[PDB]
A = this chain, B = another copy of it.
């Protein structure tokens, strides 16, 4: 109940942060996933449209996906131009959704194993993910990590 209310507060924090991110940058979709008790990466927050399609499901982390690789290696993964991906069906599925550019960023406290992924997608531009922007996403991700741990 107290923990319940802190979790509901956590939700609003996450949702507001993704909404501000989409306002400020040429991203069209953003998703936060958190590991549940069973270790599945569950969708807990998202902003923009597309959650009902390709970028929107729950994931058992696995090295064969970009998102599983980010989580499992604790290192960001990104594609600056979807035309040049090496996974041909996945590439095809994503371009069909209009995705030009994407990134998966681990959500972890400094020196600790990640407990989620921040995933972001532009249907708008390629080349979004230069080092300055990756800097900012990792800052966003750290502030999310902090807020979760609070609960």
A residues contacting B by CB (< 8 A) are 1-5, 7-8, 11, 34, 36-37, 42, 44, 151
Contact = CB atoms under 8 A, between A and B. Distances in A.
Contact of A8 (B1, B2, B5, B34): B34
Given A3-B3, A3-B4, A8-B44, 14 more contacts: A1-B37, A2-B37, A3-B7, A4-B7, A4-B151, A5-B36, A5-B37, A7-B7, A7-B8, A8-B11, A8-B34, A8-B42, A11-B11, A11-B44
Copies of this chain held together in the complex: 2
Report, nearest first, the 3 A-B pairs whose CB atoms are least far apart. Answer: A7-B7, A4-B7, A3-B3
A42 B7 CA distance: 13
A134 to B, nearest CB: 27
